[PDB]
Each structure stands twice: as C-alpha cells, then as structure tokens.
C-alpha cells in the first residue's frame, strides 16, 4: 500500500532528511548491538533537526510476548532502548518518528500507550478512484494505447494494493514484449489480469470427454440460475461475466462473477440470501436435470456452502422467527476467494461474528437440523423446478461452451433470449450444429 | 549504574492521590522521624507495594515519594534480571543492594515484579531456574541476614495474585497499597495538573469533561490533554474551550468520525435501529438517561449508538435486580422488534444480529446465574431431564422479552416515526431535543414501585395484622 512511499513523500514535501532502516536490520546474534544502532540512528536524527525516523516492519523488533537462544533477549533490549529514547524525547525539537507495520496484533501495547505512538493511522487499500489514480500514475511510465480503459480494470479488481497494480502494468508490458506489441493493448492487459488472478493457461492438459461435460454442466447451470434469477424475480445478486472450462492455475474450470457495491453488502435480507442460496444449488440442479439421477462430485463444494449458509440463516443471524438460544461455528472453513461464487455478501460466509455458545439442551438441536433440512430440500425443489422448465437454453449453453471452451455473459443472455421457456429440445436437436454461436461480440 | 539524577518530582506534581498520599508522607516520615520510631522500638517496614491498573503512573508516584523523601533514588527495570545466563542476575541484584546500602539513606524502585516474582514451579526451563535464583538472591538481600535498616524498597505491580507468597511475607513486603482508578475529582485534578503547562481559559469547566470520560486511567486523561492541542487549527479559534475537550473525549472513546457515501434506505435502517434502542431504553429505569443519539458510523462500528450513564455502584457490587436484566434483554431484542414491525416478518435484516445474540447470552447467564424461579435458582442438576429444562427457561424468557418489546414498540408508533425522521434529517441528537420529542408524542409509562414503597406497604400491613391479632386475643380474653 506504499506506507514507506507515504513517509518518503512526507519527507520530500517537507524538505527534511529521511532516515530509512528496516526492523529486520535491528536483529542480530550478538547482544547489545541493536540498541547501539538505535542510539546511533536517534542521535544522528537529533543532529539535523527537524528530521524523520522511519522503521519499516517495526513488528520484527516489537513482537508481543506470546504465551500461547539469546536473540529474544536482544529483541527485548532493543525494545527497551527504543521506548527509553521515545519517552525521553522532548517534543520541542521536532524529530518525528514513523513506524510502519503490517499487523497490529503482534505489536506490544506499551508502544500504543500515549507518549510513544500518539498517532495511529490506518492505510486502507485504495478504492475505485484510488486504484484509478494509481493506474494513471503507473501507466505514464509504459507506452499506452487509447483502447485501454483503466476505469473497468480499477472497478473490477477490488482490494488490490498499489504494488499489485504495479505488477499488473509490469506484466502487461512483459506480455506485450512477448507478443512483440508496440504498445499495451486491451487484450494484453486482460491477459495480465487472467495471468495474475486465476493463473496461466496450460497446454493441451485435458481430461476425458466425461470429465469436462460434468464441470461444464455445473458451471453453466450456476450461470443459468444466476441469469434467470436476475431476469425474472430481479434478485440482488451478481452478474455472470464469462464461463470457462480451460484449466488455469489449479482450477479445471471457472465461472466469473462481478463484484457488486459494498453498500448492498451490509443489510443482507432473507430473499437475497435465498436467491444466492438457489444460485449455490444451481450446479446440483444442473446435474440432476441433465444427467437425470446420476450426479457427481463436481458440485459437492456448492452443496457444502449451501448447507452452511442455511445454518447461518437459521442459527447465527436468526432470520426466521422461532427464537434460538445459541449459534454454532462452522466445522469447515473455506476462505473467500476468486471467480467462484462470491460468498462474501456479509463480509464473508465462513466467519461467525463470535455469535456462538456451547449448547446444553440437545432436543432443540435436532429441530434446528430438521428446519435446515426442510429449508434446503424446499429450496432444492424450487431451483430444480425452475431450471428444469428451461432445458433447451441449458443444453444449448452447455454445447456451445463445450465447443468454444469459453462463453461470455452476453452469449448466455443471447441463448436465453433466443430459447424461450417451454420450447421442445428437438428444436435444439434439429440444428446442424448445437455448439455454434451465430452472435458476434 | 542504577542511580538516577535530577529527581525533582514531588507530591504537588502528581494528582489523584487521596488518602494514599497520607501513606506516602508516612514513608517520608519513615525517612525523617525514624529516630523516635526506633526509640519506641519499631522496625521500619521495608516493603511497600503499589498495586493497580496500568497508566496510573506508579513510577510517577515513586519519583514523587523519592523527591519528597530527599534521598537517593534507584529505578531498575525488572526485565533486566531475567536472562539466558545464570548467576549474572544474582550478581546484578547483589551489586544493586550493595550500592543501595552504601548510598544509605536511599530508596530503591523496581517495577513490574510479575516478570521475576512468579511462583517457582510454573515453567520448566533454564529461565525458570534463573528466575528462582534471582528471587532467592533478592529475598536474602531483603530479609535473609542482618545489615539493612536504612534502605527501603518500593515496588509497582499490576497483578497481585502472581506474586510469590514468600515475597508477601511481612518484613519483606508488608505494606500493600492499592491505587484505584480515578473517580470524578481525581480525573479533574489529573486533567488540571497535566494541563497546567498549556494556556487555558477561565470559562473552562472540567466537570463535563470528567463526567463524559468515566472509568478511565490517568494516562487516558493525559491523552485527553494531548488531543487538546492538535485539532483546533482546522478552524483556527482563539482560546481552548470545553467543546473541544468534549469532542476529543468522544473521538477517543469510540474512534475518529469518518464520512462515506450512503443511500437513503441505509440511513433509514440505522435510524430505526437506534430509535428502537433509545425508545425501548427510555421507558426502563436502569437505562432511562439517554444523553446522546447518533447514527453516524465510527471506527469499527458502521452502526450508530445510544449513550446512557446508569448508576455505576450496583453494577460493580452485583446489586442489579432480576427485572433490571429482563429489561436489558428487551432492549437488545427491540432492534429486531422495530425491523419486524416496520419491514414485515419476511424481510428481516442482519443489522440487529449483534444485539439479538447479546439478549440470548444475557438470558442464558440469567437462567444459570441462580436468578430464576424454576424451583429456586438451582442452576445445576444431575439427571438429564432437568439439565435439558435448564435451557428451556432461557428461550421462554427471550420469548416473553420478545413479546414485551413488540408491545412496547407498537405502543409508540408516532414518536417512532418522528424520531426516525429527525435522526435522518440531522444525523445526530442530544438529550434535550430527543426528550422534548418524547414528551410531545410519548405514551403512558406507569412506573412500578421501588423497594421503599413495597417496604412501607408491607410494614403497614404487618402492623395492622399484628394489632388485629392483638385485639382478637384481648377482647376474646377480656
């Protein structure tokens, strides 16, 4: 996030000498040398007043004495010398000391006491306008074409740090070098996006024709459920960008979902959660309607996510109205991640907000389990009923995606429009090429 | 080596002293009038130990008592004694006490004895043996053999339970003084002394600042002084007033106020949440005095908050009534009550999920805290049926608080709409205008009688019944 860059800019605008030496430079094997270096740096700061002292990664020397060699004694002596020099600093001479850290939990509360670290500033990851401005700054160093729209890249890459935007533009430059491009095109920029987000494309590494039809069916069913819920009931859910079955990184297939604005990510209502949960079982709905009754293991993770969010609706948030006495923590924890389903609508899915207690009565636990089973089963019948009403669009999208190895959200929308509900499957089956897309983007 | 120079801190430099200051000057008396002390036959108590919350300035008290005593002052960190090598710490303590005895009369100060005063046999390592050796050496140099009658040790710890009872033995550490958190006057005088070095005004009232920042240590008051210097140059006024102090305290206890983009329905939701909390709180005795009401998001809390300052004596001692908790659970459930009564049952949100669990946790703590009436308290049983029934009463208690919250919030719809509109238009509300709106649109709140009226009616009933018994004995016998 450029905290070191922030301090360097402060010194540059202030016109004062900048003293940079990281926290990892204070660790040694011999004892007492680090405190001597602290004293030397401090007195050299007191020579040219005003001046700024900056210590990068201050938590290296300021590790908390966690209660969960002689180097540790050196760390404590350096901490004692630093706190003595900080507390003995008269404020009239204007020597400001800066400390950059990555984790507040491991830093000792003694420094957080007023008189040593009076000001605590958080450096939030840049917003859409912030990432826009970082892209403007970093794009002035490399040759840029007029076809690159950096606003979409700033909006579609949430929470990315400034160094990550720097590596974005650098890998775009290296991709253009690889393609021998005279400038950064939009295709190369998107290539850098898919290289750093999901990973590089492999060469000819494909499984059998059955190992790809199931993943394609699952991802296309999830996309079709999301698009149908957007089309019919006007859900507060995301939109499909593109769906792929080309292996990238360690994902054999991927469906891309846009990230919405965080203002709608605070008051998650019951209908929004129900439609997102239907979107989660869209994969198993696809396996059950396309393969009839022989489902596979490709849609198990979505099933687990649906099962946990049903419990979160029931126990943690207590959205229904029989009142419950306790919530339960997730037995399994999967981190919020990339293109797969968002599962971060309330900040995250697998994070209870310390709303759990140990249960005493074991007779209400089964009623909670039965309520969760009833909700999951009813919701499963509704999503399978809605997806089974459109078998033509689902089958055509599966065939087109299997032929092209990648489909777009606009192509899925075109298939949905050109295939209305309740049309026979023979209309798709009489075509000269079911996996043919007559629409040109 | 361990000797410090320029110890000019006195008792005037330190505030929030109280009767402890008397003991402090008693120590000064021990350093001045000890001739008649030993003439009467009193051995001077060497061990005085200050125990209390951090940031109260125990080392500042040490400097004050050393300056008032007028003797040599030694201030040694206890962290230097523990080391990976053995024997060197014992020699350090030996040199410390030898140079203290040579510099007699003197006072020696060691802070945070919990690092080296840990009970032996709690950690299995060479550091534990070194700690045991240093503890033994300091014990011997304190009381072991004759040779000290003039050197007095002062110590500052935070947790008194960790200390070795061998150290707590009289003649080694017999005087134990607790430094409490400053009250109302103590915060006043600490703010005064920490603010004497800066130009202040004559219309500056510290009473409101002290009552605003309740339950805080003297270091926090020094911090309030430190946020009385940086934030007035944004507007550029002439002299410091109490408004800046109030805003600095508000910033410190919660966080800095940051403004972000927000829609109208989000503001309405936060407003109806805060309205639910305040409106259900004002009709209850323990949470009646709501002073602030804002929906502005702060650091760590995107919600608003309601500020109340109940009596803080019954809460600490434990004299809170059973009805005082059934009221608080209703208060925590009332955000969900407003959400259900306004957006319907099918459109419950997740903004009240932080209070809806506090209510159920409070109910669970109540039912097994002995406060129930199932048999008579009886928070523990043996058979599984009664153990299962233990958690039934908590859910019925939540249900009855839940219906009570529905009834309370349904009685007050007009004032609800009014306070929601005011909260959306102004984003903040103080006690006066909120209470004015309450008086304009409030419903009837018949207060249940306190314990005094119940005692009086029971006493008069008992007297009339006993005199009835007296006449039914007398005129039947006479």
UniProtKB/Swiss-Prot annotation, chain A:
Q: What interactions and quaternary structure are annotated?
A: Oligomer.
Q: Which family does it belong to?
A: In the N-terminal section; belongs to the AAA ATPase family. In the C-terminal section; belongs to the peptidase M41 family.
What outcome is documented for mutating residue 51 to P in this protein? In arcl/ftsHi1-1; Pale seedlings. Smaller and more numerous chloroplasts with abnormal thylakoid morphology
What phenotype is described for loss of this gene?
Answer: Embryo defective.
The record's gene field reads FTSHI1
Q: What does this protein do?
A: Functions in chloroplast biogenesis and chloroplast division. Required for plastid development during embryogenesis. Might be involved in chaperone functions or play a structural role in the thylakoid FtsH complex.
Q: What is this protein called?
A: Probable inactive ATP-dependent zinc metalloprotease FTSHI 1, chloroplastic
Q: Where does the record say this protein resides?
A: Plastid, Chloroplast inner membrane
Swiss-Prot record, chain B:
Q: Which GO CC annotations does the UniProt entry carry?
A: chloroplast; chloroplast envelope; chloroplast membrane; Ycf2/FtsHi complex
Which sites bind ATP? 52-59
The keyword Transmembrane belongs to this UniProt entry's keyword annotation = yes
Topology term for the membrane: Multi-pass membrane protein
Q: Where in the cell is it found?
A: Plastid, Chloroplast membrane
Q: How does the annotation summarize its subunit structure?
A: Homooligomer. Interacts with FtsHi4.
Name of the featured protein? Probable inactive ATP-dependent zinc metalloprotease FTSHI 2, chloroplastic
């Amino acid at each position: 996030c450029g905290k070191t860059l922030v301090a360097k800019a402060i010194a540059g605008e202030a016109g004062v000498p900048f003293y940079q030496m990281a926290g990892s430079e204070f660790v040694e094997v011999l004892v007492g040398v680090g405190s001597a270096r602290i004293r030397d740096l401090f007195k050299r700061a007191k020579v040219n007043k005003p001046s700024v002292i900056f210590i990068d990664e201050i938590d290296a020397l300021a590790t908390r004495r966690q209660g969960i060699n002689a180097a540790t004694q050196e760390r404590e002596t350096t901490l004692n010398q630093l706190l003595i020099e900080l507390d003995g600093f008269d404020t009239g001479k204007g020597v400001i000391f800066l400390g950059a850290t990555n984790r507040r939990d491991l830093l000792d509360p003694a420094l957080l006491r007023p008189g040593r670290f009076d000001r605590k500033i958080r450096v939030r990851p840049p917003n859409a306008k912030g990432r826009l401005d970082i892209l403007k700054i970093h794009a002035s160093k490399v040759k840029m074409s007029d076809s690159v729209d950096l606003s979409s890249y700033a909006s579609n890459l949430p929470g990315w740090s400034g160094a990550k935007l720097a590596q974005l533009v650098q890998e775009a430059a290296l991709v253009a070098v690889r393609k021998t491009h005279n400038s950064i095109l939009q295709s190369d920029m998107d290539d850098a996006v898919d290289r750093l987000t999901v990973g590089p494309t492999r060469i000819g590494l494909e499984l059998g024709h059955q190992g790809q039809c199931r993943r394609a069916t699952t991802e296309v069913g999830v996309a079709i459920t999301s698009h149908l819920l957007l089309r019919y009931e006007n859900a507060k859910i995301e939109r499909c960008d593109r769906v792929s079955i080309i292996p990238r990184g360690q994902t054999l297939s991927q469906v891309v979902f846009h990230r919405l604005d965080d203002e709608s990510y605070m008051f998650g209502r019951l209908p929004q959660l129900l439609h997102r949960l239907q979107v989660l079982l869209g994969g198993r709905a696809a396996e059950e309607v396309i393969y009839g009754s022989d489902t596979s293991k490709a849609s198990v993770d979505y099933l687990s996510d649906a099962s946990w969010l049903a419990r979160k609706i029931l126990t943690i948030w207590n959205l229904e109205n029989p009142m419950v006495i306790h919530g339960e923590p997730p037995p399994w924890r999967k981190r919020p991640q990339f293109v797969g389903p968002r599962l971060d609508f309330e900040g995250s899915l697998y994070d209870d907000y310390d709303l759990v207690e140990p249960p005493v009565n074991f007779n209400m636990d089964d009623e909670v389990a039965h309520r969760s089973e009833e909700l999951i089963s009813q919701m499963y019948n509704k999503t399978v009923s809605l997806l089974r009403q459109n078998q033509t669009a689902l089958l055509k999208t599966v065939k087109v995606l299997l032929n092209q190895k990648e489909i777009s959200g606009e192509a899925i929308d075109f298939i949905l429009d050109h295939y209305p509900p309740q049309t026979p499957l023979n209309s798709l089956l009489q075509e000269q090429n079911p996996g043919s897309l007559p629409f040109v983007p | 080596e361990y000797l410090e120079r320029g110890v000019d801190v006195k008792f005037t430099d330190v505030a929030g002293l109280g009767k402890i200051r008397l003991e402090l000057e008693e120590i000064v008396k021990f350093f001045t009038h000890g001739e008649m002390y030993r003439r009467r036959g009193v051995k001077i108590p060497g061990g005085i130990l200050l125990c209390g919350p951090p940031g109260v300035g125990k080392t500042l008290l040490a400097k004050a008592v050393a300056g008032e005593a007028g003797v040599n002052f030694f201030s040694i960190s206890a962290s230097q004694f523990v080391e990976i090598y053995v024997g060197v710490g014992a020699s350090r303590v030996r040199a410390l006490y030898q140079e203290a005895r040579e510099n007699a009369p003197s006072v020696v100060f060691i802070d945070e004895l919990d690092a080296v005063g840990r009970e032996r046999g709690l950690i299995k390592g060479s550091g534990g043996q070194e700690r045991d050796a240093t503890l033994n050496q300091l014990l011997v140099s304190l009381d072991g053999f004759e040779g000290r009658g003039e050197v007095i040790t002062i110590a500052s710890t935070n947790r008194p339970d960790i200390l070795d009872p061998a150290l707590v033995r009289p003649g080694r550490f017999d005087r134990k003084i607790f430094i409490p958190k400053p009250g109302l006057i103590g915060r006043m005088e600490i703010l005064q002394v920490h603010a004497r070095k800066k130009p202040m005004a004559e219309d500056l009232d510290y009473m409101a600042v002290a009552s605003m920042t309740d339950g805080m240590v003297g270091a926090e008051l020094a911090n309030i002084v430190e946020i009385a210097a940086i934030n007035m140059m944004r507007d550029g006024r002439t002299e410091l007033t109490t408004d800046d102090l109030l805003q600095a305290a508000q910033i410190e206890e919660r966080g800095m106020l940051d403004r972000k983009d927000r829609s109208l329905e989000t503001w309405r939701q936060v407003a109806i949440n805060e309205a639910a909390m305040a409106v259900v709180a004002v009709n209850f005795p323990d949470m009646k005095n709501i002073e602030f009401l804002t929906i502005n998001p702060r650091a760590g809390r995107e919600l608003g908050y309601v500020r109340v300052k109940m009596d803080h004596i019954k809460f600490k001692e434990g004299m809170l009534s059973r009805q005082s908790i059934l009221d608080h659970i209703t208060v925590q459930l009332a955000p969900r009550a407003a959400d259900e009564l306004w957006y319907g049952e099918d459109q419950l949100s997740t903004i009240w999920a932080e209070t809806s669990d506090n209510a159920r946790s409070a109910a669970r703590s109540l039912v097994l805290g002995g406060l129930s009436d199932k048999h008579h308290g009886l928070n523990n049983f043996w058979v599984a049926d009664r153990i299962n029934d233990i958690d039934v009463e908590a859910l019925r208690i939540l249900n009855m608080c839940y219906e009570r919250a529905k009834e309370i919030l349904g009685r007050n719809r007009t004032l609800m709409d009014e306070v929601v509109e005011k909260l959306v238009q102004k984003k903040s509300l103080t006690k006066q205008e909120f209470f004015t709106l309450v008086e304009l649109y409030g419903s009837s709140k018949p207060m249940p009688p306190s314990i005094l009226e119940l005692r009086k009616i029971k006493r008069l009933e008992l007297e009339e019944m006993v005199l009835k018994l007296d006449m039914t004995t007398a005129r039947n016998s006479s």
